[PDB]
């Protein structure tokens, strides 16, 4: 009958969630956050439409890195100039740019297309307990049982 | 035959103030504070200290001795203190201290100045003798090794800064 | 310490003890502090400096309004100076060449003279091919690279527009300061065409 | 220091230990016997 529901842009209300990264392994935090950004938690999920929620990640500085990842997990980037390979360790990122650490981890877990790049903008990461988004009235997302 | 098991007593009248962590040992020499692991349970009788591990796993057998060694080291420094004695050897190598500042002349084109923090002091009984003194064993030993390290002993004539009584292998060079 | 002036030209001066040294004449009619930036407002500390009075008809209401706080005429060149004592500066204060003293070690910044479209020999100091022996390779930029990438790597240097670049010369010596003439004599040469903007700052390496 | 895949005690005073994940030999008698696996 071709009656399967399809969400439309603008009809679905996008909620705001706060996730605490404290002592949560980087990847397990990102995996659950990535699903929220995509709308995979809601029955209205529609692959060609953005239906996911907004996520505020607080305390990114206290995200957990198991094993020796703090010193042995290396983030390479190339400037596209010869010999332009640059590297940094995950531990160094956590201390100095913890937004980048969380954003990079979540970026890899989202689709690499227009919609996925759009969904990544709904992520806001803060090192520390406080964020500027009280005007959105975000609600706590408890992820202890989700990781 | 176990450091973690052994009993530590408190000579003279030192008093130890507990907490969730960062135990404190105080006494005539000064005050010390150190942050233990929460897995070694400590008993405090009137004058006897005994630590207690949960199990006999490698991880807990290792740390138990360390806590007892750390806590014991905390005491003997507060109660009697620690020091390192260095006997610099050379035809004209000499030392001298002005306050918390030790200036060495060990053959370099320039003199060497050494600075101590609040918890340590330099005695220098004679200009060929240096004695680090303090309340913490890590700091005293580390500072004592920096003084030795400015000019470590050499094997052909014995010159340099050596620990008093350390064995210094010498080579019968031609 | 810093000031904005214009490059007047080069000459030479005899020092005490008779040595002859080249100097560049920089004329810096007093600069005016137009704005003070602080962490509270801008997130970083700096003073905004104006140099070279400009005719009114050449200015704007937005520009005239900006210099109104300093109570000065429109200024042709406006630049910021960082790492100074902001409290010692305030809007409308004048900065004169006497801030620098003879013997001071300075850094001089300017815009190098334009040279237009130039080949890789002049632009990059590359080597010609031989001029004879059957050569048909004289002023060409050399191989673009190996075969394997199926492309040219970035920073393969070629012909293009030359000059017009910001260049800083470090550790130059202030030889004289003629305050009544608003002139600073700098030993040596500095970038830029005559009449171009020149920025004199106390040497960062000092 | 000897760096070799085969580190073994050379005399009765040599001690085999491990620091930072590497088999090492240390001797208080002969500095020639100092070894690190590699």
């Amino acid at each position: 009958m071709r009656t399967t529901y399809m969400a439309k842009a603008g009809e679905v209300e996008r909620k705001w969630y706060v996730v605490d990264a404290t002592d949560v392994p980087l990847g397990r935090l990102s995996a659950v956050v990535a699903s929220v950004l995509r709308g995979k938690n809601k029955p209205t999920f529609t692959p060609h439409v953005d239906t996911g929620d907004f996520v505020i990640v607080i305390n990114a500085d206290k995200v957990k890195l198991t094993g020796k990842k703090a010193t042995d997990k290396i983030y390479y980037r190339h400037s596209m100039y010869p010999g332009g390979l640059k590297s940094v360790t995950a531990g160094e990122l956590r201390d100095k740019n913890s937004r980048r650490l969380i954003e990079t981890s979540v970026k890899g877990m989202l689709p690499k297309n227009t919609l996925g790049r759009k969904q990544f903008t709904k992520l806001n990461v803060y090192g520390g307990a406080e964020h500027p988004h009280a005007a959105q009235q975000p609600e706590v997302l408890d992820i202890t049982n989700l990781i | 035959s176990r450091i973690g098991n052994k009993v530590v007593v408190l000579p003279a009248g030192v008093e130890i103030k507990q907490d969730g962590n960062n135990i404190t040992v105080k006494g005539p020499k000064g005050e010390l504070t150190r942050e233990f692991s929460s897995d070694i349970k400590m008993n405090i009788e009137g004058n006897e200290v005994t630590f207690i591990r949960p199990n006999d796993s490698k991880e807990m057998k290792t740390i138990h001795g360390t806590t007892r060694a750390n806590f014991n080291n905390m005491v003997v420094g507060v109660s009697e203190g620690f020091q390192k004695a260095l006997e610099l050897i050379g035809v004209g190598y000499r030392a001298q201290v002005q306050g918390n500042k030790l200036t060495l002349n060990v053959g370099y084109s320039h003199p060497v100045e050494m600075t101590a923090p609040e918890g340590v002091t330099f005695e220098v009984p004679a200009n060929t003798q240096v004695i680090v003194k303090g309340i913490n064993k890590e700091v005293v030993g580390e500072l004592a090794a920096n003084i030795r390290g400015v000019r470590p002993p050499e094997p052909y004539k014995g010159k340099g800064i050596r620990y008093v009584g350390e064995f210094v292998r010498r080579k019968e060079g031609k | 310490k810093g000031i904005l002036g214009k490059k007047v030209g080069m000459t030479q001066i005899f020092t005490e003890s008779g040595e002859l040294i080249p100097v560049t004449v920089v004329e810096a009619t007093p600069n005016v502090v137009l704005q003070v930036k602080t962490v509270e407002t801008d997130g970083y500390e700096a003073i905004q400096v104006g140099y070279q009075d400009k005719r009114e008809v050449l200015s704007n209401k937005p520009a005239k309004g900006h210099v109104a706080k300093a109570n000065t005429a429109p200024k042709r060149f406006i630049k910021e100076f960082k790492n100074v004592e902001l409290g010692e500066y305030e809007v409308g204060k004048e900065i004169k060449v006497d801030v620098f003293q003879a013997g001071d070690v300075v850094d001089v910044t300017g815009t190098t003279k334009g040279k237009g479209f130039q080949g890789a020999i002049k632009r990059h100091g590359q080597s010609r091919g031989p001029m004879s022996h059957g050569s048909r390779y004289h002023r060409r930029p050399g191989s673009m690279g190996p075969v394997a990438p199926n492309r040219v790597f970035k920073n393969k240097r070629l012909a293009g527009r030359m000059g017009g670049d910001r260049v800083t010369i470090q550790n130059l010596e202030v030889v004289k300061v003629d305050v009544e003439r608003n002139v600073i004599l700098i030993k040596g040469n500095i970038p830029g065409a005559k009449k171009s903007l020149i920025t004199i700052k106390s040497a960062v390496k000092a | 220091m000897k760096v070799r895949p085969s580190v073994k005690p050379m005399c009765e005073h040599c001690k085999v230990i491990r620091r930072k994940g590497r088999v090492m030999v240390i001797c208080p008698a002969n500095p020639k016997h100092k070894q690190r696996q590699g």
Binding site: K42, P43, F45 | - | - | -
Partner: protein, 59 residues
Amino acid sequence: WIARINAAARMNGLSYSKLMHGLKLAEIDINRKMLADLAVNDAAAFTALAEQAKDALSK
């Protein structure tokens, strides 16, 4: 449909895989197209199905 049923199942304290096992135990033949439609359009009915599945899983 499976992804949408999974989202609705979790909102009822159950994973997709356990729900389909429980519905099978309860002899419910509703297909994934219908379940996904109930998940979106009639959530109360989807909850009633989920409860029957959870009941069947316990038995």
